[PDB]
């Protein structure tokens, strides 16, 4: 087509979705991780994660307001990844990289799994 | 902080939200324009438009599944703006610029109003 494009549009949308998350506006699901609870928007979770995409396209699970993650999932690793979903920023540190990579593999967040693999390989 | 950032994350999120819109997955509102109906996600509409932000933060209207726009709003202008919300791409043409600008002013989409004003000024 002959469209024009606003460069900052996608980033501004994500910033506003994160503002809605901060203020708990229109959040429609609780993600339970080892008794730690995280409120979010199903659509943002689906847009970021192959696991959430699969969960919320399921005809029964799409209607659930609570999702319990596997007990092996670390709440801090999940928190870091949820923040990344809403900001594009990943707080990757020596002390959390193993939990973050394991959580990203479970959530099916391929680009995160990729940078974790590379950061681990650089330290070996 | 010491975060790393994935450059394409925001664009990939928006692309996935538009794929959900195309497939009518988790859409939670119908926008009615001169008897033309558009399904969308409230959170994306709020992230893009000052009007929808105001509507869906209202304690009564946040729960509505149907929103009727002012009868002066042109369905094609709305359609072009809804596409822009989900893609960052604006189909601005000589034949639609007046309807698009009027719709963007009503929806409170300041960057769109800005490029319409500039494109109109260039032709005068």
């Amino acid at each position: 087509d002959s469209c024009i494009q606003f460069t900052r549009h996608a980033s501004d949308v994500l910033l506003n979705l994160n503002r809605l998350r901060s203020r708990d506006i229109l959040t429609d699901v609780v993600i339970v991780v080892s008794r730690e609870q995280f409120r979010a928007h199903k659509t943002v979770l689906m847009a970021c994660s192959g696991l959430f995409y699969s969960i919320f396209t399921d005809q029964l699970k799409c209607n659930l307001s609570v999702i319990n993650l596997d007990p092996e999932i670390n709440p801090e690793g999940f928190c870091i990844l949820l923040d990344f979903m809403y900001t594009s920023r990943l707080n990757l540190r020596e002390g959390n990289i193993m939990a973050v990579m394991a959580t990203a593999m479970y959530l099916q967040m391929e680009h995160v799994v990729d940078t974790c693999r590379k950061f681990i390989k650089a330290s070996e | 902080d010491s975060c790393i950032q994935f450059t394409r994350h925001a664009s990939d999120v928006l692309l996935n939200l538009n794929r959900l819109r195309s497939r009518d997955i988790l859409t939670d509102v119908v926008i009615v324009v001169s008897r033309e109906q558009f399904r969308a996600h409230k959170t994306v509409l709020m992230a893009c438009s000052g009007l929808f932000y105001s509507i869906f933060t209202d304690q009564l209207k946040c729960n509505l599944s149907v929103i009727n726009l002012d009868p002066e709003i042109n369905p094609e202008g709305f359609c072009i703006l809804l596409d822009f919300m989900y893609t960052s791409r604006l189909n601005l043409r000589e034949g639609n610029i007046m309807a698009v600008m009027a719709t963007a002013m009503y929806l409170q989409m300041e960057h769109v109003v800005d490029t319409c004003r500039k494109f109109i000024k260039a032709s005068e």
Partner: peptide
């Protein structure tokens, strides 16, 4: 705004 740009030409994509």
């Amino acid at each position: 705004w740009v030409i994509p």
